[PDB]
Amino acid sequence: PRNLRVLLDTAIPPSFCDTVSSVLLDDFNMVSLIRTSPADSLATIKQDNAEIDIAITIDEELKISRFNQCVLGYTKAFVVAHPQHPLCNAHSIASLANYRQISLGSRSGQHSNLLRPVSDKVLFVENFDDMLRLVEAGVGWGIAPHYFVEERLRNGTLAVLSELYEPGGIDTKVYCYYNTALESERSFLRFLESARQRLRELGRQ
């Protein structure tokens, strides 16, 4: 035993996990890293069989039995669309409720408040890569993490629709859920401090 299993959703930057990997490797037998869609994180850890000890995700649930919650920091996500998508005036949310958007589907078909689509023209996809395939094809708009659309936004391939809603990008809170057996661990607090400093650093890029 003593095998730590950590879950990160694909809204967390890959660079972030470096800290996870460096800090708590030494304090456990074996550290395992798993990535899921933000829409599958909570449902994944709520499978007892899955034996997830730590989850780092933007999804929010009030009380998930046998898990505590704490905040690690913030990330950025933008509403993006094809640069010639009808809505590129930025009215903003008013219009979005009526056009197609590629939003992250879930294996359970249900969604939280944070991630439930806003429109009724909705096309579910499993991952951000498919989302942005369809979005770069004019099929609809979509909400995606910063690090996914950085390249494309500065290359004209994509346009931001959410500067009136929240200038600078939709700041999304990043939560850490974890086993009630870890509060009594020195490691875990070292990890929390390091992860918080790390998100704080990534925010400055």
Q: What is the DSSP letter of 49?
A: G
Q: How far is the CB of 196 from its own copies (least distance, A)?
A: 7
Q: CA 94 → CA 1, 99, 119, 168, distances in Å?
A: 53, 10, 10, 19
Check: CB of residue 10 under 8 Å from CB of residue 36. Answer: yes
Whichever of 91 and 133 has its CB closer to its own copies, that residue is 91
Question: To which residue do tokens 């959410």 refer?
Answer: 162
Name residue 142's beta-bridge partners.
80
Cα(115)–Cα(155) distance, rounded to whole angstroms? 27
CB 196 within 8 A of CB 73: yes
Q: Which of 33, 64, 88, 164 binds its own copies (CB under 8 A)?
A: 164
Residue 44 interacts, among its own copies, ligand U7Q, none and using kind-specific CB cut-offs from 5 to 8 Å, with none
* Contact track, its own copies, 26-65, x by CB under 8 A: ----------------------------------x-xx--
Per CB under 8 A, the list member of 3, 21, 32, 68 interacting with its own copies is 68
Q: Which residues bind ligand U7Q (CB under 6 A)?
A: 11, 38, 58, 77, 79, 93, 96, 114-115, 118, 143-145, 162, 165, 170, 172
Give how far Cα 185 sits from Cα of 24, 28, 53, 118, 182, Å.
11, 11, 12, 41, 5
Q: Which residue has the tokens 């550290």?
A: 31
Binding partner at 199 among ligand U7Q, its own copies, none, C-beta below 5 to 8 Å by kind: none
Binding site for its own copies (CB under 8 A): 60, 62-63, 68-71, 74, 91-94, 97, 113, 116, 118, 164-167, 170-171, 173, 180, 183, 196
